[PDB]
Amino acid sequence: IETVPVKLKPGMDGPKVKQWPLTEEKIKALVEICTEMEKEGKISKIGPENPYNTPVFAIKKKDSTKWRKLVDFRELNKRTQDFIPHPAGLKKKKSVTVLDVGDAYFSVPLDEDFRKYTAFTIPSINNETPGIRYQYNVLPQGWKGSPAIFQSSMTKILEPFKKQNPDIVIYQYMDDLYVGSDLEIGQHRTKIEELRQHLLRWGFLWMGYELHPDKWTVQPIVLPEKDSWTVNDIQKLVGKLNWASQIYPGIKVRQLSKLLRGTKALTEVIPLTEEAELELAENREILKEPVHGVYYDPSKDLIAEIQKQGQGQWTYQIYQEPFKNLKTGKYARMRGAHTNDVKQLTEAVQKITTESIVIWGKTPKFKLPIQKETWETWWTEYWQATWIPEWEFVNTPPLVKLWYQ
Amino acid sequence: VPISPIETVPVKLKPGMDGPKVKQWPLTEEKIKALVEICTEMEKEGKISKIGPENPYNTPVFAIKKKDSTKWRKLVDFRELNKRTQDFWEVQLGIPHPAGLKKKKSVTVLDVGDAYFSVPLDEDFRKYTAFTIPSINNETPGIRYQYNVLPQGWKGSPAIFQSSMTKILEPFKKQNPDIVIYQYMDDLYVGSDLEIGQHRTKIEELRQHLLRWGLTTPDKKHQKEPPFLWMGYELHPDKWTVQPIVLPEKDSWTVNDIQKLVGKLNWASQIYPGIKVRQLSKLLRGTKALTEVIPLTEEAELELAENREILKEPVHGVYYDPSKDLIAEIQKQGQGQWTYQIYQEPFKNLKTGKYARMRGAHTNDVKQLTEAVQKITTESIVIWGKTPKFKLPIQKETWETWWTEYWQATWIPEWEFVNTPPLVKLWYQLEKEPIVGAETFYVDGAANRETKLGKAGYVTNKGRQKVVPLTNTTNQKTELQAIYLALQDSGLEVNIVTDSQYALGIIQAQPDKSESELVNQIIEQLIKKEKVYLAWVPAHKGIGGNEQVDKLVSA
Numbered sequence A: 001i002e003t004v005p006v007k008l009k010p011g012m013d014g015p016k017v018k019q020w021p022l023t024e025e026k027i028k029a030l031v032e033i034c035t036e037m038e039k040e041g042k043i044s045k046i047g048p049e050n051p052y053n054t055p056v057f058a059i060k061k062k063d064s065t066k067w068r069k070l071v072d073f074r075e076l077n078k079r080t081q082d083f084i085p086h087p088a089g090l091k092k093k094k095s096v097t098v099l100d101v102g103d104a105y106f107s108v109p110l111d112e113d114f115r116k117y118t119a120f121t122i123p124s125i126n127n128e129t130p131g132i133r134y135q136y137n138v139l140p141q142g143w144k145g146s147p148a149i150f151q152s153s154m155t156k157i158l159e160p161f162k163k164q165n166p167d168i169v170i171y172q173y174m175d176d177l178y179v180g181s182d183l184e185i186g187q188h189r190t191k192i193e194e195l196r197q198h199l200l201r202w203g204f205l206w207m208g209y210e211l212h213p214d215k216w217t218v219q220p221i222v223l224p225e226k227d228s229w230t231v232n233d234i235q236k237l238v239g240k241l242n243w244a245s246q247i248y249p250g251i252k253v254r255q256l257s258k259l260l261r262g263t264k265a266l267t268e269v270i271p272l273t274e275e276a277e278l279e280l281a282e283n284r285e286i287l288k289e290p291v292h293g294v295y296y297d298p299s300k301d302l303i304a305e306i307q308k309q310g311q312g313q314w315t316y317q318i319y320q321e322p323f324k325n326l327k328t329g330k331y332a333r334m335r336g337a338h339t340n341d342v343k344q345l346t347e348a349v350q351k352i353t354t355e356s357i358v359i360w361g362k363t364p365k366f367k368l369p370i371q372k373e374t375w376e377t378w379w380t381e382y383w384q385a386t387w388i389p390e391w392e393f394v395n396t397p398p399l400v401k402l403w404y405q
Numbered sequence B: 001v002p003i004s005p006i007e008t009v010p011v012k013l014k015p016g017m018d019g020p021k022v023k024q025w026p027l028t029e030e031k032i033k034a035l036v037e038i039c040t041e042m043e044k045e046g047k048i049s050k051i052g053p054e055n056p057y058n059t060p061v062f063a064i065k066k067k068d069s070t071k072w073r074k075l076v077d078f079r080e081l082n083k084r085t086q087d088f089w090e091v092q093l094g095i096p097h098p099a100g101l102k103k104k105k106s107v108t109v110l111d112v113g114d115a116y117f118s119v120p121l122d123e124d125f126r127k128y129t130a131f132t133i134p135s136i137n138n139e140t141p142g143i144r145y146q147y148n149v150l151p152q153g154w155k156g157s158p159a160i161f162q163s164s165m166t167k168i169l170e171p172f173k174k175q176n177p178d179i180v181i182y183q184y185m186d187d188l189y190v191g192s193d194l195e196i197g198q199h200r201t202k203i204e205e206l207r208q209h210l211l212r213w214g215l216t217t218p219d220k221k222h223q224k225e226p227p228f229l230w231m232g233y234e235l236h237p238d239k240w241t242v243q244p245i246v247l248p249e250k251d252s253w254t255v256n257d258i259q260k261l262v263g264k265l266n267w268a269s270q271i272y273p274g275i276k277v278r279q280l281s282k283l284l285r286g287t288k289a290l291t292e293v294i295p296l297t298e299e300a301e302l303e304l305a306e307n308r309e310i311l312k313e314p315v316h317g318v319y320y321d322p323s324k325d326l327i328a329e330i331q332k333q334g335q336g337q338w339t340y341q342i343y344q345e346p347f348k349n350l351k352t353g354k355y356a357r358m359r360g361a362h363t364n365d366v367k368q369l370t371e372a373v374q375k376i377t378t379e380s381i382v383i384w385g386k387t388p389k390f391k392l393p394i395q396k397e398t399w400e401t402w403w404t405e406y407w408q409a410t411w412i413p414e415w416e417f418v419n420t421p422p423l424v425k426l427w428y429q430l431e432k433e434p435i436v437g438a439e440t441f442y443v444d445g446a447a448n449r450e451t452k453l454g455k456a457g458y459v460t461n462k463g464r465q466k467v468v469p470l471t472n473t474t475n476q477k478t479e480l481q482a483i484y485l486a487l488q489d490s491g492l493e494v495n496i497v498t499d500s501q502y503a504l505g506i507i508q509a510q511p512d513k514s515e516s517e518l519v520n521q522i523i524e525q526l527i528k529k530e531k532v533y534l535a536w537v538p539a540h541k542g543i544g545g546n547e548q549v550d551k552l553v554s555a
């Protein structure tokens, strides 16, 4: 019942962020939810003296037919004080399930100097009413300080389960609990539900989301294996190798661009000389080796680039320095979005963010192949994670598109 | 009959700053006479109070004679305290748009004048509202006052007032959901679909409910009768519009004529269909000096005449019906200009609007159409809480070809083709693979950074060549110029090979119109073509063709 001394960063003020417009269906759901939350004291109405505001909206889960309130605490997170060395074993795991233990936060009350900074607004259609304002009394789902404060109060709940299973890795990030065990699914499903009645003993706590870090998309860069090479094939190849030379050292393209000597038709077949095939093979060997001196620095930002490859395919690379990829991958399994580009890009951003949380314990900043105004209008309609990453936009077509497929 | 106290709002100053101390100005003898009569009166009403010598804060007060009233009027210069008062969540950050209202049988205005001064002020904040009335001949201590209610012209008075009024109106709204209420400034707008008899009783029910807090309403059948004039609009029982839009017709148009013609026709474009302002707003771009006169172009005067004929007749919009579908229809007007009408039943506009392309070197019709849709979509979430169905001048196969091939993700909500020309189309489309049996042009260009001299040309697999020398050019112009020559001197199908990452970036963006004189010529060439495959190779690697023409143009 006693609070924790929370404070912002030096010189920074609370967030003043405009609420963006919401559809009628979402306004209605936020009202129903915030009424039940008000009766339970988790939130209380506020007046005009509170000038701070953080956006709010509503989402539907993958299969939960009940809405959920999602507060965009990104601005407050940038302004909340810094308060766990990330479990580097979680990524080596074979199966990981993620649970929303967000309800657990609503039992610890929040520092009363800090509550004014958690202000949000339910808006009205056409501004025919003033917005219903609340501020949080308990810990808020989405705020950086919620897992930090609660982890002293959360280690105790699961140490009987940790005592029973030293094999199982458990990692906490925001309102999500990542639970990992290297065993068959039948044991998993009951072990995960066993982990709930152990959590139900004290206090949407029922959903399950299943990942497989071991069998994940991790890729190299590959050159084609052809028998007859056109001028165009060898040209694309020299372009790929020229771009890979910024990444790997011993890449050579001289004996290959030697074949391009002359002004032949793009569709004309060029037999490869042996100096050329020696060069192409040595480059192929080089590319299978990893990038040299590539390391993760927790002080720096993780950057993620996504390219649209067509036919529901998407390539991405996570890095901190240009040409020092910490991870690359490809996606073609974009769910239920076969005629919507923005739904695919939204689902890909969440998958990449999820993979980034497992590996490094924090989320990347995205460079999205989409125009600012299209993304900002629609990403909330398909967003299903309880966290939100940062993003910027690329307006010039990168030539790296077909280098990665 | 006892009244309820209105809960006060705890106010503080911006942290780090203190209250205001600016000096009291010298007033004429008659001005001092008036302020004493007003402030003596207001003290009787409980709105202000005398204070002692301890309070060191001072806000200056003036006296303004009314136009034809011999009743003076007080005025406190709260500008200094407003710089020091904290920030509030202004609940007026958005006003409704007439197109989103639901048609009501009856609508009554209620004027809440003295309600503003019925609202208490936080006790611990009253110290900063202090002000002095300078005495006659500066021979006594100027009598000192402080406010006990929300003062006129104070930063936080609008916010605290509307939040208190909202708190009081919520029980009424709850216990009769057949009545909607809107509050702005000093006015209450109250309406319903009730039998006009029951409506007035519920008005009285509200007026008595207001006195429960000691709030006074206009007893009289009020003089404000439709049309309600409000925030530049005119609102009638079955239709709305803007307060009249008549154009200044002049021969000499200054710079403070154009910037204010900007603000007006934009305001008028929400209901007046088809208003354009591209060439006219394009005049302002340069200077801030507020007196210059400009000659318009022959496309800015020809556009203004197409305005006036839209504005000869009054136009009106319909109110919103939640059970009929919502529809938006867009038309291209040329020169990066678009107009849209939003309606539910054909020819009955809820509202209209325009969209102008953003500033950029190269552009595309399809992207502009997409941008316009997002603007209408966001605008419709605000006013109606839903996305309209779109009727767009673009065919389903054009859009499908576009978004499946474009390098960015893009999306339009539910829409259908409407055959109202000019139609948005794809003017050209590049190949994914090299074309068999098509001549292959290796192009290159190069310029001398000093003399601005350069060459541009091509070599092909059929031995065809060209090199052209140029003056006052850059590397990027010659790389474009070379591609232009290959398009000029080739058949209906052509394979182009280039090393210009800059040129590829422009053409892979698929522009159909450009500010660059040279890019437009290339677009015109691509339109004539049947199949064009554009291929990229890295420079200075000795790629044949590229190596040969690079040497010819660098020489």
Ligand SMILES: CC(C)c1c(CC2CCCCC2)n(COCc2ccccc2)c(=O)n(O)c1=O
Pocket (backbone or CB within 6 Å): A128, B096, B101, B102, B103, B104, B105, B106, B107, B180, B181, B182, B189, B190, B191, B226, B228, B230, B235, B236, B237, B238, B319
């Ligand atoms: C009661 C209100 C929300 C309302 C109005 C009032 C407007 C006045 C200006 C600011 C925004 C609210 N109006 C406009 O009045 C037209 C009218 C209707 C019936 C009788 C007399 C006048 C509306 O039209 N609806 O539907 C309405 O529902």
Ligand SMILES: [Mg+2]
Pocket (backbone or CB within 6 Å): B444, B445, B446, B499, B539, B550
């Ligand atoms: Mg060159």
